[PDB]
């Protein structure tokens, strides 16, 4: 499922 | 199943009769009764010593839907004007519907007041109140 509601940085 | 050991009278169980005709569309009958019970007091205690009966009083009040025929006015039991002076006393009987057996008799009824209400969303209502000389039952 796509991460729309809570959005976090890319790992790098 | 039908048991006698407990039974209560209900609106359907009881006929109201006047001069040997049943009163159609009678809505209620209310019988009231008073003895004038007066307590006896004396110097020496605050307690009642005795009670005495001094004056009997009672009334029967009947509410009825005003029929187009055989009203209390048409039956002659009610009075609208001076002809009240020419109505003899009448006896009103309350009678068991099943057995045709008299439950209570009101003797010597005499009219106190007579009402009619004409209203726009309702059936017209008669109401009448009689003073009576005595009441009795026989068994």
């Amino acid at each position: 499922k796509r991460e729309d509601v809570i959005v976090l940085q890319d790992p790098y | 199943a039908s048991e006698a050991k407990q039974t209560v009278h209900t609106g359907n169980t009881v006929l109201l009769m006047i001069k040997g005709k049943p009163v159609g569309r009678a809505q209620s009958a209310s019988g009231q009764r008073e003895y004038g019970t007066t307590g006896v007091y004396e110097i020496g205690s605050i307690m009642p010593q005795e009670h005495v009966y001094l004056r009997y009083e009672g009334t029967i009040t009947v509410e009825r839907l005003r029929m187009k025929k055989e009203n209390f006015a048409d039956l002659g039991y009610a009075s609208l004007g001076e002809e009240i002076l020419k109505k003899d006393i009448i006896d009103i009987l309350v009678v068991d519907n099943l057995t045709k057996q008299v439950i209570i008799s009101y003797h010597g009824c005499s009219a106190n007041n007579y009402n009619e209400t004409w209203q726009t969303n309702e059936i017209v209502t008669e109401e009448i109140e009689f003073s009576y000389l005595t009441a009795s039952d026989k068994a």
């Binding site: 959005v7 976090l8 940085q9 890319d10 | -």
Partner: protein, 49 residues
């Protein structure tokens, strides 16, 4: 995205809803916004006052 820009957002920077990798178009009522007049740091958008 769309944001109303106010004195607080000028001083503090608009916290963007999305994790923007890059901008393909940026504009305002006055027209296009040129790259000397905006910056992104830490997923905050800073604008010329």
């Amino acid at each position: 995205m769309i944001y109303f820009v106010n004195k607080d957002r000028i001083k503090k920077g608009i916290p963007l809803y999305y994790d923007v990798k890059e901008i393909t178009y940026i504009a305002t009522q006055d027209g296009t916004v040129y790259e000397e007049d905006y910056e992104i740091k830490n997923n905050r958008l800073y604008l010329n006052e």
